[PDB]
Design a protein around this nucleic acid. Structure first.
Ligand SMILES: [Mg+2]
Ligand SMILES: [Mg+2]
Ligand SMILES: [Mg+2]
Ligand SMILES: [Mg+2]
Ligand SMILES: [Mg+2]
Ligand SMILES: [Mg+2]
Ligand SMILES: [Mg+2]
Ligand SMILES: [Mg+2]
Ligand SMILES: [Mg+2]
Ligand SMILES: [Mg+2]
Ligand SMILES: [Mg+2]
Ligand SMILES: [Mg+2]
Ligand SMILES: [Mg+2]
Ligand SMILES: [Mg+2]
Ligand SMILES: [Mg+2]
Ligand SMILES: [Mg+2]
Ligand SMILES: [Mg+2]
Ligand SMILES: [Mg+2]
Ligand SMILES: [Mg+2]
Ligand SMILES: [Mg+2]
Ligand SMILES: [Mg+2]
Ligand SMILES: [Mg+2]
Ligand SMILES: [Mg+2]
Ligand SMILES: [Mg+2]
Ligand SMILES: [Mg+2]
Ligand SMILES: [Mg+2]
Ligand SMILES: [Mg+2]
Ligand SMILES: [Mg+2]
Ligand SMILES: [Mg+2]
Lengths: 80, 129, 151, 123
RNA sequence: CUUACCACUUUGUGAUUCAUGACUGGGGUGAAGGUAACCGUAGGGGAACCUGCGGUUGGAUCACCUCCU
RNA sequence: CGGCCCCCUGGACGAAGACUGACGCUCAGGUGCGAAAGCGUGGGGAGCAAACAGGAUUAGAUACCCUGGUAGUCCACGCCGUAAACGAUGUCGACUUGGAGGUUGUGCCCUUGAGGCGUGGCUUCCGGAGCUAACGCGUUAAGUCGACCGCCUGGGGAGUAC
RNA sequence: CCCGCAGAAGAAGCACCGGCUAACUCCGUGCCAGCAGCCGCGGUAAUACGGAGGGUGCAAGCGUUAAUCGGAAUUACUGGGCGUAAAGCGCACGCAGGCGGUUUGUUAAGUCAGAUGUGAAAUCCCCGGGCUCAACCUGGGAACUGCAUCUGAUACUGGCAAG
RNA sequence: UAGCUAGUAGGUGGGGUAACGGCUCACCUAGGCGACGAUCCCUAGCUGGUCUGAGAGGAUGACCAGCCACACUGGAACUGAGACACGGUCCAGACUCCUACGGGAGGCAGCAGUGGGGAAUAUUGCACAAUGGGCGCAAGCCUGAUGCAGCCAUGCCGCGUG
């Protein structure tokens, strides 16, 4: 219903923030070997709730910092 | 280590019928029998069978016409190294349709001619003339 | 050392003054494609066609008197804007023109300078480098070329 | 080799430099001759390779081959060179264009008159 | 009228460079004989070559004068 | 890697099970090993021997030969990290005619020695199809395939300059 | 644009002709020279240089140069190699990475199918229309291989679970 | 070119903006970013497309259309819906220009055109009849947009030279 995207958390050290590395797997333009491409997306995490290495769902919102334009809807797994 | 059954299934046929053997055996698996039957079900091999309990053995019967191997060129196209998928409109041709291409469509593994009739795209397993 | 260069100059002097032309610029260098360059200072104009008449004349005399350790690679040459001048007749005619001079036994503050000629002596030249006219002894100078003003 | 290597490092397209640098892609580049000279071929052959020394407008000083005969050029002549090279003489990658404004066109030519500016004979 | 900002500037202080240009690392350079080739290294030293050690076989040189279906 | 013996220890192979349960393969970067020569310090010191020394021998002895002979060669501990370090053939797997061998296992059975049957590992040599430019390679493939890495792009310049 | 007028009347050239490549003789010529994109050409005979005839090719142009792609499988994705021709690191271990036996279940990421949205017009291409033809202009379409979303499908890959 | 970074990565609070926001401040934290190539230097307007190629590709960004940036050089805002404004303002600079020497003026990368550069590229044209745009009720006015002409074998296509 809403555009949403899931990623693993590279880091949570940031106060009230998380660094999320999301993986997207693609046909390759010349050859055709599908290679993983990752983005160091800055994500707003309230509560400083998540933990480093967790898997988590994320949705975009109005920009909120110099680098953070996304906020987390919910977490999928836990207890990493 | 071994990293592909199908390739080893194929060459075993190729090198097998190269030595003009009668029937070549290899450990069974779903894809294999799925693959293997399509040959006979197309006429590429005489017949096949599975033997043993808790042990996988596939023994398929080759065929020769006028002292000549019935299959002549068999190439695994989608490889464990690089995977290959083709949309229905774009399913290739082998020797201008004289050859058959094995395509794993979502509904079932089948011949590309049937896949075009089914209007379905799939992973191109291999070629055979 | 002069490889009989004076003898070669005498051998090629007769043809150059034979068709009347005027001799400057004797040079030879052995090596890969060993070659010698002969310059004709034609006042009328050094056309390669005028050079052509001199070149057949000098080759015909040269074959009978082939030079020692010198190959048949003569360059009948117009003395270009940067023609090299060695005699005091040149600097004499080259009254107030600049020249770049390099010498054999290089030393700290050697006469490797480029400047305008102000006076001419048989063994010495006065040439304005360092912002002052200075004595140059062509005795140790084995290479020197007249320079046009350029960018 | 293995595509996994190509994705690490793809096929570098083999670079290829031009064989006529003093042109800078301009199909012709005028320059002023600086000294003309003929040179002698080795012992077996006697010939007058007619080539001249020319500084280009852009300071690229080079030599240019002088084709034909009857040319009245000498130092300070302001000629126009063009692409092409002669296999026999090394170091010559450019030839002038016969019939250039400074050049006097080769006289008495009744064939191939476009390659020398020899105008159609009035006849 | 004064405060902050800041162009230009100036001072030095460097770096990165771009040329000009005095000067210097280096591709080409103007016979008594004993002969498989080589590789790594050391020394002789103009250098090369030979020698020292260890290793390899890759254990030979050379070549120029016309036809239609 | 080469006397004998002891002490310390790594790896391979076979037989027969039992055991875990895909725990695997490759490897940029990365560490490590790494002939000879050389270097540092200390050794040591027979033989051998660069260099050197002498004797013999032409523009000139020089080279060639003798007779010496230092470093070195050895040890200890450092350093160097290159060799035609080559099978000029990356690693792992699977498949595909044969004959001859060597070598180390081990089953069976003759009366066992022997001998007969087997069945493993390593290794040598021919040679089939195959492949290869050819030479050749040819179940230890340079054959038929797979997975991954390294690597090549005219010769010289140059494995040089920076 | 049409009508009239007079009269063949006002209107052809460049390149090449040894090979590659269509098109050949004659005299010059004396290594003089020239010619050259290369291989090569040249002496007493030169179809390769100069000239004449003759011929080829194009054509109001014809040539030369530059320049890019092609040819070039000559960076080889399609589509190359590495015993000796250039090319397997001296050898090993090993992180990252790449890849992965077999069975069932789940997932739907890959993938596939469909749909919707978008992918400007021109350009290209098809079928036309209009300029007397053509170029040119123009109608309609196709195409724009993409992207996003929704629905799907589950063989394979992946994930998850158990083997 | 392997590290890069302190308003730097984030947080609170305030201010600030049409609006989000280190936009900016105050403080708080000490992060963030890089071999999935940061950083740096060097080169370059981008796209629809164009050229080449059987294709994949490769090369390209002249004309036309979309977007961006720039308007002597540097800096600044003002006004306005919209500008940090090509034929607007101010400051600095260079240059040119005027001068009474005290000061002033100026910006063709609009259209023509000159000089220069260069192998090389055109008219100091006509008209606002058409389409457009401005202002205006309109009439109409303005428009080097545009429509046309001139120049040039620059190209394509057509035709003639019987
Ligand atoms: Mg002559
Ligand atoms: Mg060895
Ligand atoms: Mg040693
Ligand atoms: Mg000696
Ligand atoms: Mg020592
Ligand atoms: Mg090596
Ligand atoms: Mg092999
Ligand atoms: Mg000709
Ligand atoms: Mg190619
Ligand atoms: Mg090759
Ligand atoms: Mg060799
Ligand atoms: Mg080799
Ligand atoms: Mg790994
Ligand atoms: Mg995996
Ligand atoms: Mg699997
Ligand atoms: Mg369109
Ligand atoms: Mg159209
Ligand atoms: Mg029509
Ligand atoms: Mg699965
Ligand atoms: Mg705030
Ligand atoms: Mg543009
Ligand atoms: Mg333009
Ligand atoms: Mg305002
Ligand atoms: Mg304005
Ligand atoms: Mg203006
Ligand atoms: Mg203008
Ligand atoms: Mg000019
Ligand atoms: Mg007006
Ligand atoms: Mg025309």
């Amino acid at each position: 219903k809403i555009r949403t995207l899931q990623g693993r958390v590279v880091s949570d050290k940031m106060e009230k923030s998380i660094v999320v590395a999301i993986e997207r797997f693609v046909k390759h333009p010349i050859y055709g070997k599908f290679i993983k491409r990752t983005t160091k997306l800055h994500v707003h995490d309230e509560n400083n709730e998540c933990g480093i290495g967790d898997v988590v769902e994320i949705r975009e919102c109005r920009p909120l910092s110099k680098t953070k334009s996304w906020t987390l809807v919910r977490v999928v797994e836990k207890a990493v | 280590s071994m990293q592909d059954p199908i390739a080893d299934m194929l060459t075993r046929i190729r090198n097998g019928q190269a030595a003009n053997k009668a029937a070549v055996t290899m450990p069974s698996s779903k894809l294999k029998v799925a693959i293997a039957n399509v040959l006979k079900e197309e006429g590429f091999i005489e017949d096949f069978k599975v033997e043993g309990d808790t042990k996988p053995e596939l023994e398929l019967t080759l065929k020769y016409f006028q002292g000549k191997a019935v299959v002549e060129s068999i190439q695994r196209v989608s490889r464990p190294g690089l995977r290959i998928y083709k949309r229905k409109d774009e399913l290739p041709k082998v020797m201008a349709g004289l050859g058959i291409a094995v395509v794993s469509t979502s509904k079932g593994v089948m011949t590309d001619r049937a896949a075009r009739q089914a209007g379905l795209g799939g992973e191109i397993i291999c070629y055979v003339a | 050392m002069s490889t009989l260069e004076q003898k070669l100059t005498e051998m090629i002097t007769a043809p150059v003054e034979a068709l009347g032309f005027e001799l400057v610029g004797i040079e030879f260098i052995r090596g890969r494609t060993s070659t010698l360059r002969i310059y004709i200072d034609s006042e009328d104009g050094i056309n390669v066609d005028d050079c052509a008449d001199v070149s057949h004349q000098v080759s015909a005399v040269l074959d009978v008197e082939d030079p020692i350790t010198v190959a048949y690679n003569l360059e009948v040459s117009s003395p270009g804007l940067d023609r090299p001048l060695f005699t005091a007749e040149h600097y004499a005619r080259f009254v107030g023109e600049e020249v770049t001079l390099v010498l054999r036994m290089a030393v700290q503050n050697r006469r490797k300078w480029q400047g305008v000629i102000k006076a001419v002596d048989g063994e010495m030249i006065t040439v304005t480098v360092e912002g002052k006219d200075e004595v140059f002894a062509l005795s140790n100078i084995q290479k020197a070329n007249l320079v046009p003003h350029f960018a | 080799a293995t595509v996994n290597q190509l994705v690490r490092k793809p096929r570098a397209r083999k670079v290829a430099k031009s064989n006529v640098p003093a042109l800078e892609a301009c199909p012709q580049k005028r320059g002023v001759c600086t000294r003309v000279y003929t040179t002698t071929p080795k012992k077996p052959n006697s010939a007058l390779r007619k080539v001249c020394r020319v500084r280009l407008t852009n300071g690229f000083e080079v030599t240019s081959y002088i084709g034909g005969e009857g040319h009245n050029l000498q130092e300070h002549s302001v000629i126009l060179i063009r692409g092409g090279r002669v296999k026999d003489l090394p170091g010559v990658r450019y030839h002038t264009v016969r019939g250039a404004l400074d050049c006097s066109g080769v006289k008495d030519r009744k064939q191939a008159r476009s390659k020398y500016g020899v105008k159609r004979p009035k006849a």
